[PDB]
Design a protein around this nucleic acid. Structure first.
Lengths: 95, 97, 109, 83, 109, 95, 95, 109, 83, 97
DNA sequence: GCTCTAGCACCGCTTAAACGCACGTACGCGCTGTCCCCCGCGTTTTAACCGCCAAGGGGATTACTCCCTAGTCTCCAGGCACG
């Protein structure tokens, strides 16, 4: 008997095949991507919590992360991310 | 002595002004007279929309600036700067007509 | 009697899980309320990040003509970009080594 | 009613303005009549087509829509009046 | 008891119509039958091209400190881009003029 | 009222509001965009018809337009276009 | 068991014998004629289709392909083709 | 019980096919419908064009003192007519080579 | 199986004979390199198109029919191979 | 001294002989192998009939030779009998690549 | 899924193509003179632009009613495969 350990397996595999169908994966690289997504997630999450404390809002909306991604993410990366999330949330509200 | 700019300096100023400019470079009513004249050569008593005159204007000037860009390349090809009828004939013969 | 199941990722057209990140923000204990656009926004951000870095890593793997991505490809991918360098200056990569960086004085002549 | 000479109505300094838009610095004196000729020949090339659409449409008035269609037939497609 | 009229463009997550593009494919007389991927794919490539050229148009307008887009900005935006120029070599823009492309020897010394 | 002259009006304004919220649109630039969409749609539809006749196919689906995008649009734009078109058709299959 | 290939073989041979009874013909020249007939037929068909599109006509008429002959076929061959086509339809409807 | 089978091309007094060109337009997807005089006119146009180029081809074969037409004769025929060159200027030929065209300064003395 | 550098297989005297058909009297030694380069460019375009045609047709052998289709697309229509 | 012509006379004979000539100017086997070289540069295991190799052949001399009429029209425009590469890429640019 | 056929693979002579060197002649082009020709600017004219007003030709729309045209069943006959 084994307990399942959660990871970011199929999502990184699918996004790689969406960007490069003919490029393979090694498992140590897969661990590096697991640690990357966990690290950046906790960075944004902690910054969002600090903003919620800071403006005394009891909530984290899309606007808090919008603020947080010009906080941590730089510039063109941040503005492309803002655009991606903006179109994502418009598709989400349309669905 | 009245001030006089050197030959070519005012030419370059015209170049910079008109590259910066976007407006029409032909008087519109003599253009309309000419296009009505050449339309009358093929079919009598034709009528022109003013927007159609403007469209023939912009297509014509675009054709002309493309040909003149080609002849500038032909002129700098020929170690010269004064464009010549041989440059225009060359550009048209290269373009395939 | 019941609506058919559609994931929020398919509603947003993302393939990172919106529900997983929403759970992990609930149980990451960062606020007692979270706006609904927040986790899908974050998942889209990580989607852009992972897509960017997998473009870079796949391109590097083609440049060293290897079919499978390796942490060396990842470490070249991060370290050959400026804004990812600022994003991950303090990050250690296992078996990624170091970017090829020779100073000009170390060269002969 | 009939018009005989409006090819000279496209004035020489107007051609100079066009050539400045074409980036020409120095223009020979024999250029201008040739430009009149080639613009003239181009106008037969365009307008026989345009009149041909117009007489296909059983109409008498030239429209800009047919101008766009004639220009795109020769592969010199004109944006700004289609649709 | 009919389902709510929800749009195929939002099913694509896009804005250019599946409906209008499919209609002009059917009534443009290009094939007897048209697959469902055809109008969504072609609307997607038009939306990509449109987004790219209005990105360059907006940057061109803000470079000229102006707010509203003008065909001068459009023509500038097209012939800064090599693959757009190769796409639109034989197309003339209304009121766009010519981008400053001045050959070097005719410039003064 | 008059008959409706169909265009791409609201679509160009909403895609601009996605990509640049603050800038405005002139009528001349909007006519340029209408004629651009007309030209590119005409090119791709005509080449799709060409591939329909060429492979003796009465059917035009996304695969022939992927063929046509690989034909007409050069390189970078081609693979970009294939990427978001593939994302679009996958979200179409997922409705 | 092989499949029939449609060509312009005896038709071009017949009009060849009408214009020059005493001459011969090669297969390479026949490929040239077959591709020529296909290309000119396609050009006329494409311009006729575009003309029917422009003037909202849902049918292909002899008048508009005559228009197409004025368009594609230049100059004096155009009016010869007009004479030939009008004569042909005259003896066709009289038949 | 039935009328005798009569070819429509010979009804028009032409050799080129009313039937094959009509069916090929109807399956060529240029409209939904075709007028009755349209394929007769198209066949007449094609028969005229082929008659002209075959007349010049027989002339070229007689000039080369040959009986059977060669694509060299066809290229010689097409390039020696200005209006056919205006028709076929962008068309490349198989085994036709080039028309004899030596320039003024290319010739010696 | 794999090849590296067969582009000189189109030899220099082949290019000279081509220019003799093109009516070039004197062909500089600098010329042959960009002729090979532009020939690479043109064939890269044509074979890209042709490979796209064949991969659309789910085949593994290029036909000359797809070649003349690629020449229809790019604007160099060729006669005589079943187009 | 042995028999030897002035420069250009043999060139004129070459020009006349291969404007008269209808046969193929380039070698078959390295052309087919170069086609294969570009083929496996794009997708491996790609095959060609001899007719397709002939078709790409015919396209190659058509394209290249047409560039040479355009090129020597450029060369006679530049008052020169010796062609230089700048003629070729300027001609390609005027053609509208 | 089958099949069958020309491309792929491998094999064996044959000098034409290639190629390379060497003599030779022509080729491009810079300097510089020389001649010439069109731009810059000033002045003068004049209709272009503006702006303002009358009028009607036909573009466009709606309706009507009829010309026509693909489709299909069927039949037969000339073009394609084959020699």
């Amino acid at each position: 008997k084994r307990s399942r350990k959660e990871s970011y397996s199929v999502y990184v595999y699918k996004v790689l095949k969406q960007v490069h169908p003919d490029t393979g994966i090694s498992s140590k690289a897969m661990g590096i991507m697991n640690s990357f997504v966990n690290d950046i997630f906790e960075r944004i999450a902690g910054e969002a919590s600090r903003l919620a404390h800071y403006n005394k809002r009891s909530t984290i909306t899309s606007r808090e992360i919008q603020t947080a991604v010009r906080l941590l993410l730089p510039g063109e990366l941040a503005k492309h991310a803002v655009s991606e999330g903006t179109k994502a949330v418009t598709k989400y509200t349309s669905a | 002595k009245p001030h006089r700019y050197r030959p070519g300096t005012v030419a370059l100023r015209e170049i910079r002004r008109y590259q910066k400019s976007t407006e029409l470079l032909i008087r519109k009513l003599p253009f309309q007279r000419l296009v009505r004249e050449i339309a009358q050569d093929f079919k009598t008593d034709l009528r022109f929309q003013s927007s159609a005159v403007m469209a023939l204007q912009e297509a014509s000037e675009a054709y002309l600036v493309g040909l003149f860009e080609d002849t500038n390349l032909a002129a700098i090809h020929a170690k010269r700067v004064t464009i010549m009828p041989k440059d225009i004939q060359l550009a048209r013969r290269i373009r395939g007509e | 009697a019941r609506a058919k199941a559609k994931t929020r990722s398919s509603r947003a057209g993302l393939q990172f899980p919106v529900g997983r990140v929403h759970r992990l923000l609930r149980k990451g204990n960062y606020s007692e309320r979270v706006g609904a656009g927040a986790p899908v926004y974050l998942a889209a951000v990580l989607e852009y990040l992972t897509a960017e870095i997998l473009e870079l890593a796949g391109n590097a793997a083609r440049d060293n003509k290897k079919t499978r991505i390796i942490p060396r490809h990842l470490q070249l991918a991060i370290r050959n970009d400026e804004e990812l360098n600022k994003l991950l200056g303090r990050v250690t990569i296992a078996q990624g080594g170091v970017l090829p960086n020779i100073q000009a004085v170390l060269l002969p002549k | 009613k009939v018009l005989r000479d409006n090819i000279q109505g496209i004035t020489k300094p107007a051609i100079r303005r066009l050539a400045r838009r074409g980036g020409v610095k120095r223009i020979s004196g024999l250029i201008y009549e040739e430009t009149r000729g080639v613009l003239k020949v181009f106008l037969e090339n365009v307008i026989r087509d345009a009149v041909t659409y117009t007489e296909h449409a059983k109409r008498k008035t030239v429209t800009a829509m047919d101008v766009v269609y004639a220009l795109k037939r020769q592969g010199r497609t004109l944006y700004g009046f289609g649709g």
